[PDB]
Amino acid sequence: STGSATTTPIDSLDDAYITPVQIGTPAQTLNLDFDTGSSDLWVFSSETTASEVDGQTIYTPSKSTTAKLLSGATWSISYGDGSSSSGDVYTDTVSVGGLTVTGQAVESAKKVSSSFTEDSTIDGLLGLAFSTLNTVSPTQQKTFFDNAKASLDSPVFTADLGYHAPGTYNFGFIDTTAYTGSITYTAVSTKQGFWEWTSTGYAVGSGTFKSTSIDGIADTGTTLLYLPATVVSAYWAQVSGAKSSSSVGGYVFPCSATLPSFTFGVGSARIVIPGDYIDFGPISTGSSSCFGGIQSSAGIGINIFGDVALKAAFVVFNGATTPTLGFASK
């Protein structure tokens, strides 16, 4: 089997992407944030504290003839941005782009933090990291991809995120029309539960490529590109007036600037992020200070190849017995 679903930016900045997901019988369609940096499929629901729901579409298990309470199971998750959610668990039928999994753990939110409530466009998350990170207790649950894998034509999914435009998540096949050149594959460590890999270096604009190993994770659920402070300083030093602002929380730059591109290495191959992809617009409405899309990872503990980097590529998440990542230009 295969599936194919369009993923759409939630706003004009590509802060995140939503993909429609069918849950239950009859189908209830929710727009979920596919997150290769976490491993829980959780949804706003009929159980979510009413004051914490503000415009989201909710899953109502009592209206699904295939929903079953997973008795005793609870979940609770905290994300790198400080947001969080928790609740109980049902199993139900879940379909993405025509690919159906029966018995998928659907984690129903009883509580969500304010950032979730405040984002009316995201009805929940669909985790695509390794199932060892799943938070369900006392019996850890499998991701949608893990459950689908055996049925897929090939044990892979691909992320093709658009810049200010829709893109595609495919399951079970590699669309050879969706990229240019060849796909370069690179080793993955699953030791931390992430799609963790080592970039071979970087360049700023038309500058020379610096060969240096950068360990990080491919994370569709993180907006920006978080890299070591040395690398980030080298990038922003090429932008007149750019500076790191402790009050804003990162590098800012004059909105009048033209940003240089940023290249990262995948083995001997190179992925070029155009300068425009690094512009996240005014820090506040009407400001002439703009927020940078490349930021330091120094306070995180890990480097994160988020959407800024991934949307410059066609990315293969290869879930073979030994997982690997593939990157192609597009």
Tab-separated table of C-alpha atoms in Angstrom:
chain	number	residue	atom	x	y	z
A	1	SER	CA	0.000	0.000	0.000
A	2	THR	CA	0.847	3.691	-0.221
A	3	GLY	CA	-0.562	7.019	0.899
A	4	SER	CA	-0.153	10.571	-0.371
A	5	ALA	CA	-1.423	13.721	1.339
A	6	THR	CA	-0.961	17.421	0.730
A	7	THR	CA	0.529	19.458	3.562
A	8	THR	CA	-0.262	23.169	3.771
A	9	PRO	CA	1.427	26.019	5.678
A	10	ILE	CA	-0.709	27.342	8.515
A	11	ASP	CA	0.241	30.996	7.884
A	12	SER	CA	2.205	33.294	5.590
A	13	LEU	CA	5.481	32.526	7.406
A	14	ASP	CA	5.386	28.720	7.120
A	15	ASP	CA	5.371	28.514	10.924
A	16	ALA	CA	4.082	24.937	10.629
A	17	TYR	CA	2.295	22.684	8.152
A	18	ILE	CA	-1.035	20.865	8.500
A	19	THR	CA	-2.092	17.651	6.782
A	20	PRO	CA	-5.658	16.278	6.787
A	21	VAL	CA	-6.074	12.971	8.631
A	22	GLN	CA	-9.196	10.799	8.753
A	23	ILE	CA	-9.959	9.328	12.185
A	24	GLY	CA	-12.768	6.967	13.091
A	25	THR	CA	-15.902	5.607	11.445
A	26	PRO	CA	-17.518	7.581	9.888
A	27	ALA	CA	-14.356	9.557	9.230
A	28	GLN	CA	-13.643	12.656	11.282
A	29	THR	CA	-11.098	14.776	9.412
A	30	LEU	CA	-8.632	16.712	11.564
A	31	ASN	CA	-5.701	18.800	10.352
A	32	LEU	CA	-2.588	17.498	12.103
A	33	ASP	CA	0.983	18.750	12.369
A	34	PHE	CA	3.183	15.889	11.142
A	35	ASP	CA	6.178	15.939	13.465
A	36	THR	CA	9.298	13.851	12.742
A	37	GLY	CA	10.637	15.050	16.126
A	38	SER	CA	8.028	13.333	18.322
A	39	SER	CA	6.167	10.041	18.457
A	40	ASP	CA	2.628	10.709	19.754
A	41	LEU	CA	-0.493	11.067	17.629
A	42	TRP	CA	-2.680	13.306	19.777
A	43	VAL	CA	-5.794	15.313	18.984
A	44	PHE	CA	-8.072	17.968	20.334
A	45	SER	CA	-11.168	16.061	21.373
A	46	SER	CA	-14.555	16.065	23.060
A	47	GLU	CA	-12.559	15.468	26.276
A	48	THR	CA	-10.407	18.601	25.988
A	49	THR	CA	-11.071	21.171	28.714
A	50	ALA	CA	-13.577	23.464	27.030
A	51	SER	CA	-11.751	26.688	27.927
A	52	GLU	CA	-8.657	25.332	26.142
A	53	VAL	CA	-10.435	24.814	22.797
A	54	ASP	CA	-10.635	27.889	20.535
A	55	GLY	CA	-11.566	27.026	16.955
A	56	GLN	CA	-9.903	23.614	16.555
A	57	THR	CA	-11.749	20.687	15.070
A	58	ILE	CA	-12.214	17.989	17.704
A	59	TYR	CA	-12.259	14.202	17.593
A	60	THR	CA	-15.324	12.762	19.339
A	61	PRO	CA	-14.662	9.061	20.023
A	62	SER	CA	-18.252	8.404	21.089
A	63	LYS	CA	-19.332	9.116	17.491
A	64	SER	CA	-16.864	6.587	16.015
A	65	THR	CA	-18.106	3.010	15.811
A	66	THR	CA	-14.493	1.779	15.641
A	67	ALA	CA	-13.138	3.705	18.648
A	68	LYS	CA	-12.189	1.714	21.742
A	69	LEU	CA	-10.852	3.087	25.005
A	70	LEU	CA	-7.329	1.809	25.659
A	71	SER	CA	-8.084	1.037	29.263
A	72	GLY	CA	-5.725	2.558	31.815
A	73	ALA	CA	-3.539	4.306	29.261
A	74	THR	CA	-2.519	7.927	29.736
A	75	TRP	CA	-0.088	10.207	27.968
A	76	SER	CA	1.719	13.450	28.701
A	77	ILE	CA	4.205	15.261	26.502
A	78	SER	CA	6.352	18.396	26.640
A	79	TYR	CA	7.891	19.888	23.516
A	80	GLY	CA	11.115	21.818	23.000
A	81	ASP	CA	9.225	25.117	22.792
A	82	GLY	CA	7.757	24.622	26.271
A	83	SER	CA	4.283	23.614	25.096
A	84	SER	CA	2.578	20.517	26.429
A	85	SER	CA	-0.515	18.332	26.349
A	86	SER	CA	-1.877	15.243	28.085
A	87	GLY	CA	-4.872	12.938	28.248
A	88	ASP	CA	-6.123	9.396	27.714
A	89	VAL	CA	-6.030	7.025	24.750
A	90	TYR	CA	-8.345	5.351	22.262
A	91	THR	CA	-7.558	2.994	19.443
A	92	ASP	CA	-9.281	3.764	16.149
A	93	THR	CA	-8.881	3.617	12.395
A	94	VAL	CA	-6.632	6.350	11.011
A	95	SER	CA	-6.097	7.107	7.332
A	96	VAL	CA	-3.594	9.476	5.715
A	97	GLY	CA	-3.861	10.157	2.015
A	98	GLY	CA	-5.570	6.823	1.341
A	99	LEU	CA	-3.320	4.715	3.609
A	100	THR	CA	-5.291	3.133	6.452
A	101	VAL	CA	-4.103	1.791	9.809
A	102	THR	CA	-6.537	-0.031	12.066
A	103	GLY	CA	-5.960	-0.066	15.802
A	104	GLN	CA	-3.886	3.131	15.834
A	105	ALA	CA	-3.410	4.742	19.234
A	106	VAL	CA	-5.216	8.095	19.101
A	107	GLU	CA	-4.222	10.121	22.152
A	108	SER	CA	-7.138	12.297	23.227
A	109	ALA	CA	-6.163	15.553	24.896
A	110	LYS	CA	-7.739	16.412	28.203
A	111	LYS	CA	-5.366	19.374	28.661
A	112	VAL	CA	-3.321	21.465	26.237
A	113	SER	CA	-1.021	24.397	26.930
A	114	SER	CA	-1.824	27.923	25.828
A	115	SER	CA	0.195	27.851	22.610
A	116	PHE	CA	-1.952	24.984	21.324
A	117	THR	CA	-5.200	26.699	22.301
A	118	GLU	CA	-4.028	29.898	20.615
A	119	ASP	CA	-3.360	28.130	17.296
A	120	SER	CA	-6.799	27.429	15.840
A	121	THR	CA	-5.317	25.847	12.699
A	122	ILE	CA	-3.658	22.824	14.349
A	123	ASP	CA	-6.031	20.112	15.569
A	124	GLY	CA	-3.244	17.914	16.952
A	125	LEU	CA	0.085	16.280	16.149
A	126	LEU	CA	1.032	13.108	14.265
A	127	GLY	CA	4.430	11.937	15.468
A	128	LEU	CA	6.860	10.358	13.017
A	129	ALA	CA	9.997	9.907	15.142
A	130	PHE	CA	10.815	6.473	16.560
A	131	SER	CA	8.214	4.749	18.725
A	132	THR	CA	10.675	4.543	21.629
A	133	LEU	CA	9.771	8.211	22.301
A	134	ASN	CA	6.024	7.562	22.554
A	135	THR	CA	4.728	8.799	25.919
A	136	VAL	CA	1.766	6.447	26.470
A	137	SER	CA	1.889	4.697	29.843
A	138	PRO	CA	1.924	1.970	31.017
A	139	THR	CA	2.061	0.405	27.533
A	140	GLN	CA	4.028	2.433	25.000
A	141	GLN	CA	2.304	2.761	21.631
A	142	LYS	CA	3.529	2.720	18.029
A	143	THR	CA	3.520	5.622	15.587
A	144	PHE	CA	1.297	5.652	12.513
A	145	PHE	CA	4.351	4.935	10.339
A	146	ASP	CA	5.479	2.050	12.546
A	147	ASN	CA	2.015	0.489	12.354
A	148	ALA	CA	1.758	1.003	8.584
A	149	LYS	CA	5.308	-0.050	7.722
A	150	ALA	CA	4.748	-3.754	7.093
A	151	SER	CA	1.902	-3.010	4.659
A	152	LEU	CA	3.762	-0.319	2.704
A	153	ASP	CA	5.255	-1.070	-0.700
A	154	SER	CA	8.549	0.240	0.716
A	155	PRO	CA	9.209	1.071	4.410
A	156	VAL	CA	9.638	4.806	3.833
A	157	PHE	CA	7.899	8.128	4.029
A	158	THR	CA	8.927	11.377	2.361
A	159	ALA	CA	8.560	15.040	3.334
A	160	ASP	CA	8.325	17.584	0.519
A	161	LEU	CA	7.522	20.852	2.290
A	162	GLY	CA	6.753	23.950	0.265
A	163	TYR	CA	8.096	27.457	0.642
A	164	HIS	CA	5.003	29.629	1.062
A	165	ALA	CA	3.114	26.889	-0.788
A	166	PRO	CA	1.609	23.436	-0.251
A	167	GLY	CA	3.736	20.306	-0.342
A	168	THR	CA	3.350	16.561	0.113
A	169	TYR	CA	3.829	13.727	2.584
A	170	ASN	CA	4.068	10.335	0.836
A	171	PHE	CA	4.063	6.941	2.541
A	172	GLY	CA	5.421	3.778	0.995
A	173	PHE	CA	6.995	5.123	-2.197
A	174	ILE	CA	9.483	7.662	-3.521
A	175	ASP	CA	8.026	10.004	-6.172
A	176	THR	CA	10.913	10.273	-8.611
A	177	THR	CA	9.255	13.304	-10.270
A	178	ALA	CA	9.367	15.337	-7.052
A	179	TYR	CA	13.105	16.076	-6.943
A	180	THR	CA	16.052	16.926	-9.172
A	181	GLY	CA	19.310	15.038	-9.449
A	182	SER	CA	19.878	12.115	-7.119
A	183	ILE	CA	19.009	11.397	-3.490
A	184	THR	CA	22.016	11.261	-1.160
A	185	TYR	CA	21.499	8.940	1.788
A	186	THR	CA	23.205	9.377	5.146
A	187	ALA	CA	23.397	7.336	8.336
A	188	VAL	CA	20.905	7.724	11.184
A	189	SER	CA	21.348	7.130	14.896
A	190	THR	CA	18.148	6.094	16.669
A	191	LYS	CA	19.797	6.231	20.122
A	192	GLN	CA	17.809	9.333	21.159
A	193	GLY	CA	14.643	8.283	19.309
A	194	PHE	CA	15.107	10.934	16.590
A	195	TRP	CA	16.025	10.956	12.910
A	196	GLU	CA	19.526	11.992	13.990
A	197	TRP	CA	22.243	12.375	11.378
A	198	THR	CA	25.534	14.207	10.799
A	199	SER	CA	25.797	16.991	8.260
A	200	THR	CA	29.208	17.320	6.611
A	201	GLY	CA	29.434	21.120	6.827
A	202	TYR	CA	28.100	24.429	5.616
A	203	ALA	CA	28.578	27.518	3.484
A	204	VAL	CA	27.235	31.056	3.813
A	205	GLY	CA	26.105	32.680	0.577
A	206	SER	CA	28.732	32.316	-2.124
A	207	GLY	CA	31.404	31.584	0.490
A	208	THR	CA	33.644	28.566	0.641
A	209	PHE	CA	32.290	25.363	2.137
A	210	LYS	CA	33.497	24.578	5.658
A	211	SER	CA	33.900	20.842	6.214
A	212	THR	CA	32.790	20.101	9.772
A	213	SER	CA	30.533	17.467	11.319
A	214	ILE	CA	27.210	18.796	12.645
A	215	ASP	CA	25.056	16.230	14.441
A	216	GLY	CA	21.376	17.126	14.405
A	217	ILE	CA	17.839	15.901	13.905
A	218	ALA	CA	15.507	16.155	10.915
A	219	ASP	CA	12.437	17.675	12.589
A	220	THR	CA	9.404	18.688	10.541
A	221	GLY	CA	7.761	19.899	13.746
A	222	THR	CA	10.308	22.648	14.388
A	223	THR	CA	9.977	25.839	12.328
A	224	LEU	CA	13.567	27.075	12.234
A	225	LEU	CA	17.128	25.829	11.707
A	226	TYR	CA	19.051	25.586	15.009
A	227	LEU	CA	22.823	25.191	14.652
A	228	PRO	CA	25.959	25.698	16.760
A	229	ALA	CA	26.694	29.257	17.815
A	230	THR	CA	29.882	29.401	15.720
A	231	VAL	CA	27.966	28.549	12.530
A	232	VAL	CA	25.093	30.922	13.280
A	233	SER	CA	27.470	33.799	14.070
A	234	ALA	CA	29.270	33.219	10.756
A	235	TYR	CA	25.931	33.396	8.918
A	236	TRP	CA	24.584	36.572	10.537
A	237	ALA	CA	27.949	38.333	10.260
A	238	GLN	CA	27.188	38.545	6.517
A	239	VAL	CA	23.998	40.571	7.134
A	240	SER	CA	24.514	44.274	7.815
A	241	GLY	CA	22.881	45.259	11.068
A	242	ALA	CA	22.065	41.741	12.222
A	243	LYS	CA	22.494	41.067	15.921
A	244	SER	CA	21.536	38.616	18.632
A	245	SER	CA	18.840	40.155	20.832
A	246	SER	CA	18.348	38.673	24.290
A	247	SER	CA	15.068	40.581	24.621
A	248	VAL	CA	13.635	39.183	21.394
A	249	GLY	CA	15.126	35.722	21.899
A	250	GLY	CA	17.505	35.320	18.984
A	251	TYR	CA	19.068	36.889	15.944
A	252	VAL	CA	17.182	39.740	14.322
A	253	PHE	CA	18.077	41.679	11.208
A	254	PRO	CA	16.882	44.787	9.361
A	255	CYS	CA	13.762	43.982	7.362
A	256	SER	CA	15.352	45.961	4.504
A	257	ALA	CA	18.148	43.375	4.139
A	258	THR	CA	18.605	40.836	1.380
A	259	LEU	CA	19.652	37.621	3.122
A	260	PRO	CA	22.377	35.302	1.821
A	261	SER	CA	21.674	31.652	1.183
A	262	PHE	CA	22.843	28.918	3.556
A	263	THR	CA	24.198	25.583	2.289
A	264	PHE	CA	24.402	22.408	4.365
A	265	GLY	CA	26.261	19.227	3.466
A	266	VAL	CA	24.752	15.770	3.116
A	267	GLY	CA	27.736	13.546	2.492
A	268	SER	CA	29.369	14.955	-0.619
A	269	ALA	CA	26.093	16.599	-1.703
A	270	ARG	CA	24.875	20.099	-0.892
A	271	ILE	CA	21.427	21.497	-0.102
A	272	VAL	CA	21.024	25.254	-0.647
A	273	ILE	CA	18.517	27.165	1.488
A	274	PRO	CA	17.685	30.401	-0.382
A	275	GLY	CA	18.044	33.589	1.623
A	276	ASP	CA	14.320	34.338	1.486
A	277	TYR	CA	13.567	31.109	3.382
A	278	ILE	CA	15.485	32.567	6.353
A	279	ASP	CA	13.220	35.645	6.685
A	280	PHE	CA	10.540	35.216	9.377
A	281	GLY	CA	9.265	38.742	9.132
A	282	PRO	CA	8.770	41.535	11.622
A	283	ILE	CA	9.320	40.676	15.276
A	284	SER	CA	6.033	42.465	16.009
A	285	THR	CA	3.452	43.901	13.652
A	286	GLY	CA	4.868	46.904	11.831
A	287	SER	CA	8.414	46.574	13.163
A	288	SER	CA	11.387	47.046	10.843
A	289	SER	CA	13.304	44.413	12.818
A	290	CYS	CA	12.848	40.958	11.309
A	291	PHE	CA	13.338	37.575	12.947
A	292	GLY	CA	15.990	35.222	11.606
A	293	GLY	CA	15.310	31.678	10.474
A	294	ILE	CA	18.734	30.406	11.533
A	295	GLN	CA	19.241	30.475	15.302
A	296	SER	CA	21.699	29.109	17.819
A	297	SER	CA	21.140	25.660	19.318
A	298	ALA	CA	23.417	26.471	22.261
A	299	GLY	CA	20.511	26.486	24.725
A	300	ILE	CA	18.783	23.381	23.325
A	301	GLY	CA	21.295	20.557	23.671
A	302	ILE	CA	20.834	19.381	20.071
A	303	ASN	CA	21.015	20.858	16.586
A	304	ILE	CA	17.688	20.875	14.752
A	305	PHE	CA	17.221	20.741	10.972
A	306	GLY	CA	13.704	22.163	11.101
A	307	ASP	CA	11.389	23.316	8.344
A	308	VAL	CA	13.721	26.117	7.158
A	309	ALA	CA	16.222	23.441	6.129
A	310	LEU	CA	13.884	20.588	5.206
A	311	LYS	CA	11.691	22.632	2.865
A	312	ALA	CA	14.745	23.263	0.670
A	313	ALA	CA	14.922	19.502	0.004
A	314	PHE	CA	13.014	16.374	-0.831
A	315	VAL	CA	13.600	14.280	2.290
A	316	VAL	CA	13.344	10.485	2.551
A	317	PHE	CA	12.766	8.968	5.990
A	318	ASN	CA	13.895	5.398	5.326
A	319	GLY	CA	12.521	3.063	8.004
A	320	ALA	CA	14.308	-0.053	6.831
A	321	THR	CA	15.811	-2.354	9.467
A	322	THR	CA	18.759	0.045	9.525
A	323	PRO	CA	17.123	3.468	9.088
A	324	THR	CA	18.713	6.167	6.948
A	325	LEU	CA	17.838	9.664	5.729
A	326	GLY	CA	17.916	10.808	2.115
A	327	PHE	CA	18.110	14.365	0.789
A	328	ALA	CA	17.675	15.616	-2.775
A	329	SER	CA	17.436	19.087	-4.227
A	330	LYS	CA	14.135	19.988	-5.872
